[PDB]
Amino acid sequence: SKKGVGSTKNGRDSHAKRLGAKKADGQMIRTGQIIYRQRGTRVYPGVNVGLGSDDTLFALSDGLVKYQKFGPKQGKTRVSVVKHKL
Amino acid sequence: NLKAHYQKTIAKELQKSFAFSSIMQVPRLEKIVINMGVGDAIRDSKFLESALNELHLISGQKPVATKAKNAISTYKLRAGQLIGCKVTLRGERMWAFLEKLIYVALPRVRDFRGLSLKSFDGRGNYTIGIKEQIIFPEIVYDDIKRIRGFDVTLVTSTNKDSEALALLRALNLPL
């Protein structure tokens, strides 16, 4: 009765890349620090934002973070860092 | 010369035939292309150099290479290896080649009837595919594995097909 599948098929698994929304609209950000990490481009660089070509979208200036729709059918979300009032 | 005859008399005759108020709407000719390719063999057997020789001695510009848009090898086509050559001729050499084609040596086969039936895609096109190249006078000897004609495909600025018929009939093309 104890006799089962030997040489079982793929049961392997990778790790989990800790990405997502590290920041959100409503928190002041220091320059240089990360905002969002993503595999691909589901968020696009708008104004005052640095794009490192390792799937990196970080803040390039000071201010407050906002998210706006864009694209054909609001499929794209562009991150913006609006500057503080002067 | 025949350009000074054409653009002085036949253009006016065509524009009076179909009463038009536009001089650039009449069936005219501004560009022709002649292609070449060897699908029968890829092996360097009087190829890629014989095409250069024949196109230099028949046309007014050197051959230009291009590779296939896909990779189909059921008849041995791999590893890139561009085939054939192309000349998209323009300017005065266009009409020089036209005069060489029409009124020099095409009258060499008794039943040369051309192709006036089923040669239109619908946007003002014409094609002539012949089997012999030695049919021309300006040919060399012992520089070819097997004689093969050059397909000429001419396009114009008129999308309509009736004007293409008028253009072909104005230069006395076979029916």
Binding site: - | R93, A96, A105, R108
Partner: protein, 44 residues
């Protein structure tokens, strides 16, 4: 670039009308004994 082209007098016993505008300069006295006047398709 490319070898220049020119025209030499065209000769034909069935044409008697020279077709000499621009063929090439590499040859001399282009001549063909059959033309379109004797050819029914190239006649009116």
């Amino acid at each position: 670039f490319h070898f220049p082209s020119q025209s030499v007098s065209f000769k034909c016993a069935s044409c008697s009308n020279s077709f000499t505008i621009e063929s090439t300069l590499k040859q001399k006295e282009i001549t063909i004994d059959i033309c379109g006047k004797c050819h029914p398709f190239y006649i009116g």
